Amino acid sequence: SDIQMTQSPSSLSASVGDRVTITCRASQSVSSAVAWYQQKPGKAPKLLIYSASSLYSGVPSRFSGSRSGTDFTLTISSLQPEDFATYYCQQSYSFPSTFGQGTKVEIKRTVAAPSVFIFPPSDEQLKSGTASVVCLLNNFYPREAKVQWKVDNALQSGNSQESVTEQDSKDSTYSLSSTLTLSKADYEKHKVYACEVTHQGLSSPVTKSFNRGEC
């Protein structure tokens, strides 16, 4: 039978200088064969605590492991902003080895309103029959933001796709790119294209827009 590493919480928002506690609970005893790893987006994992309380070579004293029976807990005394990452427990007490589902940690800063811009589809693209309109919400926080496309004052539904940056660890902020896509024919059927942002840092939903053709 496999040893389960059951980590919680799935995710953690907290303030710089907070204490954050992540707990992992091994379905069987794993002695002290528990290791904690920090993984930032796109990088490899990096070792933090080996053998469940032993601070790895070169890891900052604000990290620490803690065993209590079948319960292991990684503990940051005071967040720095760089400490944005996903954290995983591992057990190597037996094979197969096993990891926690991880815990995603988020910085917390004051609010910043999004800088907003809108991009009308490039002239090469419209030749190729496609028409993509891009709207950018730049360097903002918190990430919870509503975008609404309106074409000739009609709300659009199910033809935009957005994506977000991770927290710029220096910035502790986010950037979003919402993308309305139409056929060239459907693009040539309307004049005005607009992008309506509702964000907590805005007192009023900001709209950047353009007309088809204006130079």
């Binding site: 993984q39 053998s51 800088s115 730049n138 950037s175 790119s177």
Partner: protein, 220 residues
């Protein structure tokens, strides 16, 4: 230190196919260390895969691969291998290579990881991006639109990497074609518009596609 791990042999593979990942070691010999493969499906977690024990060659495998994968090692080549057979979709992941540390120093911790190779099990064929420019209009923003490619990954640098600051390149999202589209943007002060050349460099190795799209202002 010189301790380094270099995965390779990843890519796009048809389901049911095979692949042999490779992991070259630098600055240490793998003869004295336990060596593990660890994989991560996109935006999912770390999954232990296989491992081979120093001095014995004893191999251990995660149960989701047992009898389709095969960890192994050539001492002389200071290289560790992983033969994957009868692959399926859910085998898609970045496949990382890690050195289990020396016991007296780092317990059974994995102390050195590679950068991981990307394994993309799908029958859909490759297709490189069309790259369109995002024209701008005391600062405003401009970028590139990296549209309808497959598979991941693509890479954007502006001005051959000379322009690093202010840039946001967004994660590819999945077009309902199945292709990936993404866009990259940098903000600049509006003065530089006339006098500053702004090229984004797009590379999509799976397709052997390299594009450089000069981003200039509104023509009129």
């Amino acid at each position: 230190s010189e301790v380094q791990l270099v995965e390779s042999g990843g890519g796009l593979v048809q389901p049911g196919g095979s692949l042999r990942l490779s992991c070259a070691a630098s600055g240490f010999y793998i003869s004295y260390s336990s060596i593990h493969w660890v994989r991560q499906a996109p935006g999912k977690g770390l999954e232990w895969v296989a491992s081979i024990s120093p001095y014995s060659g004893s191999t251990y495998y995660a149960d989701s691969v047992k009898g389709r994968f095969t960890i192994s090692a050539d001492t002389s080549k200071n290289t560790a291998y992983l033969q994957m057979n009868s692959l399926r979709a859910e085998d898609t992941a970045v496949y990382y290579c890690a050195r289990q540390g020396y016991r007296r120093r780092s317990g059974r911790g994995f102390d050195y990881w590679g950068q991981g190779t990307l394994v993309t099990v799908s029958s859909a064929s490759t297709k490189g991006p069309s790259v369109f420019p995002l024209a701008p209009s005391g600062t405003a923003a401009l970028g590139c639109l990296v549209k309808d490619y497959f598979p991941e990954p693509v890479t954007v640098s502006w001005n051959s990497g000379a322009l690093t600051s202010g840039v946001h390149t967004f994660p590819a999202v999945l077009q309902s074609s199945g292709l990936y589209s993404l866009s990259s943007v940098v903000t600049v002060p509006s003065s530089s518009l006339g006098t500053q050349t702004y090229i984004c460099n797009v590379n999509h190795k799976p397709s052997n596609t390299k594009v450089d799209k000069k981003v200039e202002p509104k023509s009129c």
